[PDB]
From a paper:
In some pathogenic microbes, the response to oxidative stress is controlled by a SirTM/zinc-containing macrodomain (Zn-Macro) pair responsible for establishment and removal of the modification, respectively. Strikingly, however, the “catalytic loop” found in all other MacroD-type enzymes (also termed “loop 1”) is replaced with and extended loop containing the zinc-coordinating Cx(4)HxC motif, here termed the Zn-loop. To gain a closer understanding of the functional role of the 3α-bundle and coordinated Zn2+ ion, we solved structures from the three sub-branches of Zn-Macros namely from S. aureus (SauMacro), Methanobrevibacter oralis (MorMacro), and macrodomain-fused SirTM protein (Mfs1) from Fusarium oxysporum f.sp. cubense race 1 (Foc1Mfs1) in their apo form as well as of S. pyogenes (SpyMacro) and MorMacro bound to ADP-ribose (ADPr). In all structures, the Zn2+ ion is tetrahedrally coordinated with three metal-coordination residues within the Zn-loop, while the fourth coordination-contact is exchangeable and is provided by either ADPr, a water molecule, or a symmetry-related protomer within the crystal.
Given the intrinsic linkage between Zn2+ ion coordination and catalytic activity, we were unable to crystallize our protein with Asp-ADPr–modified GcvH-L or a peptide containing the modification. Therefore, we synthesized asparagine-ADP-ribose (Asn-ADPr) as close, nonhydrolyzable isostere for structural studies. Having synthesized Asn-ADPr, we were able to crystallize the MorMacro:Asn-ADPr complex. The overall structure closely resembles the ADPr-bound form (RMSD 0.515 Å over 245 Cα). The ADPr moiety placement is isostructural to our SpyMacro:ADPr complex with zinc(II) contact made by the Nδ2 atom of the modified Asn side chain, which again leads to a tetrahedral coordination of the Zn2+ ion. We could observe an isostructural water molecule in our structures of SpyMacro and MorMacro in complex with ADPr and Asn-ADPr, respectively, thus suggesting that the Pα phosphate group could act as Lewis base in the reaction. Moreover, the C1’’ centre appears to be strongly positively polarized due to the direct substrate coordination by the Zn2+ ion as well as the coordination of the 2’’ OH group by a conserved histidine-aspartate dyad (Asp116 and His120 in MorMacro).
Residue numbers in the entry: -1 to 260
Amino acid sequence: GPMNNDEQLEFLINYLLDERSESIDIPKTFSEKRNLLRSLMNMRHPSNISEEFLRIQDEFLSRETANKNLTSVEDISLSSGKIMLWQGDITTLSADAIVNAANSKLLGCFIPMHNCIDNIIHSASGLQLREECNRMIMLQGGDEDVGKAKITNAYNLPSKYVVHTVGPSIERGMRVSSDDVKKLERCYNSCLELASEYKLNSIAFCCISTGVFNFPQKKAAEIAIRTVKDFLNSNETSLNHIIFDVFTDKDYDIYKKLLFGN
Ligand SMILES: Nc1ncnc2c1ncn2[C@@H]1O[C@H](COP(=O)(O)OP(=O)(O)OC[C@H]2O[C@H](NC(=O)C[C@H](N)C(=O)O)[C@H](O)[C@@H]2O)[C@@H](O)[C@H]1O
Ligand SMILES: [Zn+2]
Ligand SMILES: [Zn+2]
Ligand SMILES: [Zn+2]
């Protein structure tokens, strides 16, 4: 009969355990049981899975998505021209496309429960995301360079597409080279160019390179804003709304000062 919420969750865990030959007792709460699935999903290198698993995975995750506090693009009220500014979780936002800050293998994040945007996006979207990116890397025959863009379905997310870009990474101790500036520009240009070719009306960016890859937050923002404006000045595009989705208070405050002059 109709497997309810707990019965679906408890199925999926057992599946991934039995494919790695073990079993640990199922924790008490819903919350701890939920993190075990995340953990098992994050850790699973790409390969075939049963259509039964996908179907049920999709029912479970779509439901979770539908029960969050979703935000529509037309409901963001802070805007300057086609640019909007918004603080919130990119997995709650109904844009045509969201941008993922990814790595050169484009497989997402293998640490259980890490809070990088790559893990967060793959954990809400589903295993199909890793599988689709893996088919694209295999056909390309080679890792993805910094500053390009690739597009995929968004699966159980509330958006339609995900755009994957790999930003530059700043070694601990070193200052930012003119070459690193140019590469982070190219991330923004590639993502705009791709969404333009797909004729999308809205895209949401995260603050690429500013977490694990350790780019200074203020300098990143000056670049992101100048690049987006030069692109909108210089091209025709179907884009009406380009959303800087910021996650930390400090990035909110940085972006707010530079866009809305105090
Ligand atoms: N929900 C959210 N919505 C909006 N913005 C958010 C959200 N959450 C965070 N964010 C924000 O997204 C921005 C992007 O930060 P970020 O660290 O995700 O990305 P970054 O571009 O600076 O770095 C990307 C790299 O690290 C990952 N890799 C790992 O984590 C692997 C590891 N080093 C290993 O040893 O195994 C990933 O595969 C790639 O390799 C930040 O401003 C957060 O506040
Ligand atoms: Zn509109
Ligand atoms: Zn991570
Ligand atoms: Zn193209």
